[PDB]
Every structure is written in C-alpha cells, then in structure tokens.
Symmetry: D2
Subunit: 307 residues, 4 copies
C-alpha cells in the first residue's frame, strides 16, 4: 500500500474442462459465478468481496495461470505506477476497459520470473454477496461447499528472484514480510506484503519460469478447515497435504487439486505484520519446518508438482 | 494509511492502584511488563507486538485515558503530519524523545471530542515476546492468563464527531469503515480504519467530552474467548458482556473491567475492509442489534458506564 | 444402565400452532420430519439418531410436556421394570404398540414431581439420517439450521424431589451425577445420569408440579453454538440467555424459545461421569454461578419462565 | 457395562528410559505423576479422572504393554466376572491388593490375542485433580503441555480376533460398536465399547500376539488437537500422522511416539453409540478411507510400527 496497490484483485487460470472446473469452484469452493464472456470465460467471486469478480476461468489445452491482477486506489496511482514501470524498463501492455467484462483498464507487465501481473483502478462494485448494505447480517444463508471468504494470495515458482524483488519493492510498493535464506544469505523465497497480511504474493526460486505453485482462498477458522477436508473426502477431490500449519506465516492450511491439476490452498489465520517490522527469517536448514511446521519434513510433491 | 499512519502504538490509562491493576493486566490479560520510569509508570506489551510497549499504566486519583498514540511509517511522515495539523489550525504539542521511556518524540494534539491523540515515528524495537527471530515458533511457551495477542483499538465517547471525522479522515488519513446514522441521516457513530481492520479507533456521540468507553485487546479464536470468560469468572473479575457478537464489525466480544473500573474488551474475528469499500451502515432503529447481534437489545452499563 | 434403561427415547411437546412450531423445529434446529399421525401429531428426529423419531409435536390449547420416554435394552428389561413400578406401588398405564406411530408398547407413569415418564423396549430402527450403513461419511450433506445432533435431556421443575429421587434411582436404575444443596443440606436440584452423561434428566424444586423448564438438543462444538446464535438473530427467535457456560455439568449452552413459548436449549461439551464418581455438589449461596458460570448471577426468565 | 465393566482403568507400559518417559508423559502430555513404588514403577493420571492413577510406567529394556485393566462397578461384579472367567475355561491370575500401590485386588487373564487384561473394583478415590469437590471450576490452573483429559482407550494388534470377540462380548459384557470386514465377510477388526464410547478397546488382525499399536488420551476440541500439534513440533517429538480424521469412529486424531517408541494418540469427538445400535461396517476395499478419512490412503508406519 506504499505506492497505492491495495490487494490481489483477480487471477485468470487455465482449465482443461470448464464444466469440471465449475463443479469444483462453485460446488466445493463455494465461489459465486457472476458473468460469462464473448470468449467463453466464466467470472467468479467470493462472498465477502465487494467487487464483481476475483477468479476468471478460461478453457485451454494446458492448466496454469494467465495473469494475476492487483487493484490500486485510483487512476492517479494507476498512471503513476504505469509510468514508473515503463521508467524502470518494464515493457508494459495497456489493456482496455471491457476486455475483461466489468473491469476497468489494466496495465499488464511481465515479471522477470516469467509471470504476468496486472494493475487496475476500476472494477464493478456489486457489494458483498447475499447481504444488504444497511443493517447486514453476519453472513448469507445459502453459501455452498467451503464458502471461501476471499481470494487471498498465490505462490509462484520463478527464475530471477533478485530482479523480481526489486520490481515489487521499488516500483510497486510491496514490502518484504517473510524470507528464507541459505548459508550465504541468499533469498530462496520471498513473501511480499501489501498491507498487514503475511503475504499478498510470494515467489520461491525455480529453474523454469512462469510456474504457479498454488492459488489460495481465505477460510475463517480451524474448524472451517476440518469441514473443508471432510468435503474433500466426501467429493473425492485430490488432497496434497491435509490440515496442518505452515512454518512460514504460521497459518493453518490444506492443499488440494482441481480437475485440471491446478493446486488450490484454503487457509486461515496466520501472523500479521506492518511495514516497520523486520522480515521474519527462516533458514534453508529448516526448510522442512519452514513449509511443514508439524512434520518438519518436505512433501516430495510439494516441490515437484506445479502447473 | 493514506498519510502514512499505520496503527495505534500505545495508550496511557489512569488507574487507582498500580498493584491491583498490574495483577489484572499481567495475570488476567497476560500482558508483559517491560519497563518502569521515575514517574512511577509501568510499561507493558503483547507478545505478537514488535515494539517495547503498547500500554503504559499510571497511578492517578481517577481512572480514564490520558492519550492514545499512533505510530507512523517514518520520520518524513511525522514532519508532514505535524505541519498539516498546524495548517488545519490544530494546536500541536511537542513531546521530546525520552519523556516516555524508550519512545521517540511525539506530536500530541486534542481532537474536538476532548481526547488527546499523538503520532510518533519510532519506539524501541524488541521484537516479538519470547520468540526467536530465525525459524520462529508458532507461539511463546510461558504465557499467563488470556495471553492477549495485541492492543487492538479503543472506542471514545465524545462531543464533536463531525469535526473529529474531518480531522481523522482529512489530515490524519484514516477512512470511514462503518457508521450508524439516525433518522435524519445524521452520523451518530463512526468507526475509522487505517488499512484492513474494521476500525483502529472509533467515536460515539456523547454530550460530555473526553470519555473512554473501552480499550480492546485482540484474541485469536472464538474458543479463546470462551477461555477468557472462564478466567474472568475464575479470578472473579467484573464482566459487562459475556461471549457474544456485535452487529457492527461482526466481531465476537466480551466486555469486563479492571480494578480501577476501566472497561477492557477482549475480542476476535471481525470483518475486514479496504479503502475502496463502501461504509457499512447501521441505523438507530436497529441500534440494539447494531451493538448486540444476538440479543438485539441494549445494555444499561454498555451505553452509560464510561471513564 | 443399572436396570437396562439406556437413554431419552422421545418427548411429546404441546405446541400452539403446528406450522410455526415446525418452522422452528425443522428450519431452525434442523430436525427431520419423519412421520405424521392420523390425528395431526407430527414426528421428528435428529440425524445422528438411529431410531425413527425423538420429538413429537401436537397442537393443544397450551404448551408444555405431555410425556418423556426412555428406551430400555430389551422386552425383558421392560417387563421387570413394569413389575417393579407396580410392586413399588405405582399406577402404571400400558399403551399398546402402534398407539404412537412406528413405536412399540409403552409403560407410562407419572412421577411424584407431577411429570409423566414412560418406558418402551423398541421403535422402528432407521439408521443415521442421510448416511450409508457401510463406509459412512462423517456427516449428511443437506442439514438445515443448527443441525442438532440429538435430543439430549430435559429439565423438569417439580414438587417431590426426594420421592422422585428414590423412584429414579432405586427403581429405574439412574444415579445422580450432580446436585445442589441448600443451607440446611437439603437437595434442591438433582441431575440424574444413566451412564456417562452429566445428566439424562434433571429436576429442580418448584412449588407447582408438572412444569417443563426446557428440552435440550446436542450441538457438537462451541463454534456451532456460535452459528446457532447467529441463526437465532437472522430468524428473529426469542433468545433467553446467550453463549455461556453452566457451573453444573460445565456445558456450553444457549436458551431460546419455540413459537409456543416452550424453551429450547442447545448445548455442547458438559462433563462426563461414571457410576463410581461422587456427585459433584454446588451450594445455594453459589447458585448464580451454578447456573451461569461466566456471569455468576441468575436471570428473570431462567427461574420465572416455565411451561 | 452389560455385566459391570465400566471403563478402562489403567495400562502399564514398558519404557526404555524412565527419565525420558516421564518428560514425554508429564511435560508434553500433561499427565500428573501421582506415585512411585519399590520396583521403580511410576504412577500417573489425567486430571478429569477421579481415581489415583491410570498410567503406570515401568522401566524395562523392551517397549510395549504389560497389561490393560478395566474398573468394574463393585466387588460383587468382580467376583461374578472372576467366576464366569473360570467357568469359561480361562486360567485366571489373582493379584493381591497392594500389588499396585493404592489399588485393590485384580483378576488378570490373557486374551486369545495374547494381550493381558485385568478387572478390579477398588482404587484409592482421589477426585479430579486440582479442583475442590464443592463448586468446582471448569478446569485446574496449572495443566502442562497438551493437558490430556483422560486415558481413553487402546488399540491392539492381535491374532485370535473371533475367540477374543466372544470372550469380551460373552463374558465381559462389551458390545461391537464398529467393525471392518473383508470380501469374505471376515471381520478383520472389531471396535468394542462398554457404554457409549465408540470404543473402549479394539483389535486389528495381525499375525502376532500381544502387540500394542497405541494407547490413547482424550483431548476436548479440534483446536486442542492443533495446540498439541504445535507442541509436538516445538518439543521435537516424532509425529506419526498429523491432525486428521478417522473413517472408523470419525474422531479427529494425531498419532505420535514416546521416547521408547510406543505410539501415543490424542483425539477428540468420535461417534457415540448405545447397545441397540447396529455395528457400523467398513469394508476392506475402503480400508484406506476407513483409517484415514481425508487422505484415503494407508501410511506405511501405521500398519507396520508396533508395540
Ligand atoms: Fe499459501
Ligand atoms: Fe471495541
Ligand atoms: Fe440443560
Ligand atoms: Fe484410537
């Protein structure tokens, strides 16, 4: 929030089968569908979210992430981060309003790590789902599946971490919240925050660019996580790593896959920070614990399986 | 966070007896006693907090709050903010570094409602309590009582909300998160946020200035609230409102008093928002439910007992 | 279980309006309507329950309890008890099988305190609602409201507690797990257990016989209690006493009312016991806390309101 | 409880090191050391338990279980089961009162599965740990680590399942709560209960006699299970299977090991049942889900690591 960037606003994932993806995202995750495209894309949101959509699905031949967008305070900030990116040397793409139904104009650049990110000031305000603006209840009564609270963050596997770190900190205004260093003091992973969250975006080093480790969704409680895991067994969804706690951020989490092999994370309550806190450090000799607090060892497929 | 204001950093409470008060804040709330000065004040903190203190107790002839200080992003910000206050015509007060042990210089000022607030750019960093900084544990091993996570906010009863609103949103950079208006569309209560919290400070209209409704400490889970309640009963503390939930901010709350009569609130899981979110509105005709979601009726003590 | 008595089998409550009562009992509490008598008597059950029905509603001029049934192990246990009640000198009424739809024969009797209890050896077995018999899931997918686990117990306000005590222990094989004694060591409340529960049925002294204080349903967790209370507000149900804890049993509870004025308590996690534990004792000077542990004081409706 | 058997009263385990064993059980588990006898046996208990002890460690150069005893109602039921055991054709062993400090006489036998069991009527009544008998608080103040509630049950890996089944049901008055059978309808595992618990003892088919799979302690909630997982991680205890849910019994669970290799379990909220319930069935084709509900796969250590 240092340069006007407030939060992750939307992510567009690629799926092999739309119908399968919708069963998963609307029936299991609890995501509410909102729009459809000229191009056949499907727009979805979470209920505590005020804007039109946060998740957009696109039928494609390979799964993965097309791009992640962050919403900025206003247009003044949009032009100022747009010019700074071009001034920094980043070749920017100007996306026109409407190219994504109900979304303002976007600035799409490519991170040195190979991922495409977007910045945007506008998006259609539909308000919280199933709730009134005046004298609102605690929650809408007919939410489904897990009833994801909101699109929280996403973790990426990437190639140039130093250059990506400079881009996000210097030109975009993210601050380092968590990090994992090796014996030399080299950042193997970096958790960047935009406000008080342990992280709004994160990168872990990888030989091949553009990899997506997972897209997360926020859940409220530890008993919500148990409910979610019961739902996984119930629907026979594939689970990566059950209810546990992360060494980094100390948040409770469950990893599972969608019909396309994309990994989804659902998690609740981690640690908070503020721009003035020193980054929490984890070391490479504690990589097991840093990822999996309770087992202190690494899931083979945690590092191998990407999309 | 628009003008660079991050969070409430400390609040100085007047207590009648330091001994009974200390026993309350450390054995019941589970706060950590960090220091003591030549004026006979004791400084305390919460364990998730990174700075030296958040609560400074002061033995007086009357309970109540002296001032509440918010920490800003940096020195530059502190300069800007103090200049802006003077331009607004607000009379600032300068407190040199050291008058409050381990705290830097501060810019004190009195809001129209009779309360003193102050900004400060820095304080002694001690890091999280009982926790190493590399490969940190999920929590410290020897915590007392409720083990409050952090000093969250405070609610003020005062006279001139309207002008206070401009003061806080226009010069200080806060933003209205929620509000309750009366029949004539007149804002009778305003909940101001800095970043993602439902509120970092809040004011409710009251004929006499200066009043302090309560100081709040954040707890983590609903079950943590059930434990605090057991403790309030166990240690025979005075309870104002048992495990319930507010309509405003939808957070789960418990109200109780310290040996001096100040009301402390312990709570968890409210609602989050962002600068671009439209204010949630509650009306006076739903005022009972606005405050007490479950019962939907007002409590005698709750609107009438202040310090 | 000292003389074959297993658990509270079913309860027949009088409602003033069937439709309103049904909305409360199927829509709010989540009880499944299973049958409908040829005389406008409707049968409902909780999902974890293995038999066809636990609650039976019937329109009458006033609210209250007609009878409370307990299920015994087998027909033989039903005979010896039948013999024992009669030999004990008790007026026994025998209802033929089928008088209550899908229910076996019953032996009813009115206890000294003025209430009607009845034993029965069998009832149509249905298995858990919405679950397979082989490789069952953790829970059925389409539960409404609070989704109560099971009819748990009921609190009777009566006049002859000693006589009632002898009847329930010596003849029915119950044992008191808890009690409250007054100044002159007189048992003012008795919590009678059948096996491990803190109480399966309880009696509190009241000048008038026959009064039904409340009927309880089990909810699994403290967070479910919270969800139940959120529902109550959204439903606008009359709440008696919010999320709190008792001293007796130490269970978490919420008292509310059905549309006919009958009290309904939803609770979780009391204490357990076995026939060899000495009865936990509470005293009259500590009454406030014995009932409301957190608040330590009694509330109007708690004692005033009966049905 | 058909025949007087109320619940598992105690279990004596063999530990390679007493200094270490004591740290695991008192520090990590929260058990209270209550005694130590001549042969260096040390007695311990869980706080909600009413009798002197439940766990008794013995230093021996081989880990494992020596015997598991059950407390029966009275001396009468003991002479009765003892008679029935001799009549059944069993070789009984009469332990004199005092063999185990503060414990009465005991009848011990070897079940066809090779496991030794005991029956006893008397043990020094001590009451809940650290709680006055009149007007008890909800919980003691100084409970360490996991603060185990009570010694719950134990799973045994034996050979003669059909023979043991008859012995327990017929002579000991236990009832088959849950079971799992193969394609040939051969009962591969039996979960037997005394009263309402999903199981007080269970046997899984194994080609070896006398093997101990795990001994269990009850923890109240899912969040308690989480705190336990943090502690295991913090104390660097060997964890077998993280916070999950079992298919059988549906209880939330965590498997881990003591300093001698004996597997310990901590869990909360299984299913409840009564003597009239049909035994829940799990078919071997779903053995994966039956054991590990969320994962639906079998972890090597689970059916391999033993005694
Ligand atoms: Fe994540
Ligand atoms: Fe507050
Ligand atoms: Fe009750
Ligand atoms: Fe077990």
């Amino acid at each position: 929030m240092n340069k006007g960037v407030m939060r992750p606003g939307h992510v567009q994932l690629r799926v092999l089968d739309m119908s399968k993806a919708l069963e998963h995202y609307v029936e299991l995750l609890g995501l509410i569908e909102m729009d459809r495209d000229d191009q056949g894309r499907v727009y979805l949101k979470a209920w505590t979210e005020v804007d039109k959509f946060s998740l957009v699905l696109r039928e494609a031949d390979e799964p993965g992430m097309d791009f992640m967008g962050f919403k900025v305070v206003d247009e003044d900030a949009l032009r100022q981060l747009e010019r700074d990116l071009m001034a920094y040397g980043c070749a920017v793409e100007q996306l026109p309003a409407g190219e994504l139904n109900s979304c303002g104009r976007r600035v799409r650049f490519q991170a040195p790590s190979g991922h495409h990110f977007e910045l945007y000031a506008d998006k259609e305000y539909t308000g919280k789902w199933g709730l009134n603006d005046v004298n609102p209840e605690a929650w809408p009564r007919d939410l489904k599946g897990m009833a994801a609270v909101r699109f929280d963050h996403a973790l990426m596997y990437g190639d140039e971490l130093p250059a990506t770190y400079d881009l996000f900190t210097k030109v975009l205004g993210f601050y380092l919240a968590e990090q994992v260093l090796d014996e030399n003091g080299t950042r193997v992973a970096q958790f960047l925050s935009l406000s008080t969250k342990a992280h709004d975006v994160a990168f872990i080093h990888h030989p091949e660019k553009g990899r997506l480790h997972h897209v997360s969704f926020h859940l409220e409680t530890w008993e919500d996580l148990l409910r979610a895991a019961d739902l996984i067994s119930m629907t026979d969804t594939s689970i990566d790593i059950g209810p546990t706690r992360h060494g980094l951020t100390h948040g409770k989490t469950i990893y599972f896959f969608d019909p396309s092999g994309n990994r989804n994370e659902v998690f609740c309550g981690g640690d908070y920070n503020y721009p003035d806190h020193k980054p929490v450090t984890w070391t490479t000799d504690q990589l097991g614990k840093a990822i999996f607090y309770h087992d202190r060892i690494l899931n083979e497929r945690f590092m191998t399986v990407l999309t």
